[PDB]
Amino acid sequence: EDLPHHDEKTWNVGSSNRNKAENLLRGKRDGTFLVRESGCYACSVVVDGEVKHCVINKTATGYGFAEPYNLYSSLKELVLHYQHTSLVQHNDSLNVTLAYPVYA
Numbered sequence: 001e002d003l004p005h006h007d008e009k010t011w012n013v014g015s016s017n018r019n020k021a022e023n024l025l026r027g028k029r030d031g032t033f034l035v036r037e038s039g040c041y042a043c044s045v046v047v048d049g050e051v052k053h054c055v056i057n058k059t060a061t062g063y064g065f066a067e068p069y070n071l072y073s074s075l076k077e078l079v080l081h082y083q084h085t086s087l088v089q090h091n092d093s094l095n096v097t098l099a100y101p102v103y104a
Contacts, residue, residue, distance in 0.1 A: 005083055008076050010101035011035055018044070018053060024102055025051045031099030035075055045087075047096045054087070054094065065090045 004010045013024065016036040021044035025032055033045035041056035043065070056063060056078070057070045063078045064070030065087060072078035079098050087094040 003080070003083060004101050004104035005076070005079050005098070007101075008079075010104045011079060011098075012037075012075065013102065018042075021053065022051050028102070029100065031096055032102055033098045033100065034102040035079065041075070043098070045094070045096055045098060047094055052094060052096075054091065 011033060012035045013021070014037055017038070021034060021036055024034060025044060025046050028046050030046050030048060033043060035056065036042050036044060039055065040058050041063075042053055043056050044051055044053050046052070054065060056065065056075070059070040062071040062073055063075055064072055072081060082098045084097065086097055
């Protein structure tokens with residue numbers, strides 16, 4: 001019953017790239033997502049039938065999608081927040097939550 005997001009291996013694919021992310025998310029439902037590393041981090045998430053990508057900033061104050069909200073202490077804390085809060089506030093093309101970990 002607890003969210004699958006609590007196991008970071010269900011969504012953090014480690015060192016990867018945009019193409020690999022597209023192949024992993026192809027055919028997945030809206031809200032399926034992953035976090036990838038290498039520009040250190042990014043989020044790939046399915047929105048309205050398309051795979052979308054955005055940067056995850058790693059700053060002095062924490063992780064986030066945009067200032068003044070780069071304040072999450074870890075990637076897991078970031079993911080848990082955006083599991084219930086839409087990314088739409090940061091981008092009108094990203095009206096989605098991080099609902100389904102790619103490997104859950």
